[PDB]
Write a protein that binds this ligand. Structure first.
Ligand code: NA
Length: 129
């Protein structure tokens, strides 16, 4: 599913991301825009052999199981395919583990290079929240 911008925020707000570990909701919308273009079926392979999955591009070296990432962990205890659902629940729940790992949102490279320090409230403007 490809979310609309305001529709995504509603989904994120309802699942408890607004101000989760102190990141305002706009940070999470901005990170989804630049990670996946709001497309829940986004996948991207990396040079190490890992793959990033779903609306927040969660990586199979640490976070989910894809059966092809040798030696990797599965810290969210999910198959990477769950991250591709139209229902974002599994993505959000895993995201909350990742941001709580010590480096905050810097674990998302698009966030660090395209959102951090920018006017991220602009991503929720106009929305009925
Ligand atoms: Na893995």
């Amino acid at each position: 599913k490809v979310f609309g911008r305001c529709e995504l925020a509603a989904a994120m707000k309802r699942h408890g991301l607004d101000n989760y570990r102190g990141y305002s909701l706009g940070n999470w919308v901005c990170a989804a825009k630049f990670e996946s273009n709001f497309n829940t079926q986004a996948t991207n392979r990396n040079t190490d052999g890992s793959t990033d999955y779903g609306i927040l591009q969660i990586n199979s070296r640490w976070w989910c199981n894809d059966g092809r990432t040798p030696g990797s962990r599965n810290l969210c205890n999910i198959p990477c395919s769950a991250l591709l659902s139209s229902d974002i629940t599994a993505s959000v729940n895993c995201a909350k583990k990742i941001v709580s790992d010590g480096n905050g949102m810097n674990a998302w490279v698009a966030w660090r290079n395209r959102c951090k320090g920018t006017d991220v409230q602009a991503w929720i403007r106009g929305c009925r929240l």
